[PDB]
Amino acid sequence: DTTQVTLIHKILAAADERNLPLWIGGGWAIDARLGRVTRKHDDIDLTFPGERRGELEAIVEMLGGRVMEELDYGFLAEIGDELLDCEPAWWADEAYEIAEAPQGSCPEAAEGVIAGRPVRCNSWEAIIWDYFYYADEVPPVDWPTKHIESYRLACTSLGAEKVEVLRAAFRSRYA
Template sequence: MVVTAHMDADEVHAVLAALTDAGCRAWIGGGWGVDALVGHQTRTHRDLDLAIAAEQEAAALSALGRLGYVVETDWRPVRVEVAADGRGRVDLHPLTFDEAGDGHQAGLDGGSFRWPKGCFTTGTIAGRRVDCISVNQQLLFHSGYEPRDVDRADLAWLHRLAARPAPGDERRP
């Protein structure tokens, strides 16, 4: 399948609504996750990266299928990417949650990535509140590889956000 569209904010909200209607919770990562933390769109996006509970993966894929998305890359249990021509791509990252609320994602090498409970936060896309991944977790995920231009742009925003004083912090930048 050749997917020619970029993911726009309306499509992000359509995907999130379909997942919510199917009883699936999703946290936005990647470029759209950075934009959610910033509070506005900073660049165009090829896809929408979502962390979901592994036990909701089938329901999520079914919901996305109703929107016209079909599996394009299947590296389960690590990730599965679906695409819809004219709409874009959604990259699902299934997490298994432990009793403490930490998420664990399988790695391609047989290991796993830890998503600490505190990394799940909220942001804003096109004026709507969304669940997303924290600045620190995004910085962690942007390490360990040679960044592309879009990654460098995301990292610049993340570093700006990380340098901001926390709410209630009396220090001035």
């Protein structure tokens, strides 16, 4: 969506004004790290400081949107027709961390680009990590192409050995 790209800019601009860091996650995070739009994305994934949820909600409402229901891992919001999938991160020692995610999931540096603009986005490890859950719940043979090819891009970018080490950590933690 041209709509999603512009909505991302609008959200980040509003967050910047509030000195509120926000990380782009999921599909858009992959494209941000690649610096190229590769794929339609169902929604916009956001990671936010859990202790400043109120400020994110205010941004959403400022933009004519609304906060919808709680999710198992965060909350859902909406601007126009577009859905915002929002997950909190919490201050660790010198960075924010998503609960039950790899260390370094919310890097301070803006390490991606969307439509020429630098953006904060979740790490490759954090991105990959969520595919592990997905694989436990949905047989990868039933994954749509949009998710399959994005997963493979992430694996290509991170490297096969690092992915398998991360998978081992995932399996071990949840066994």
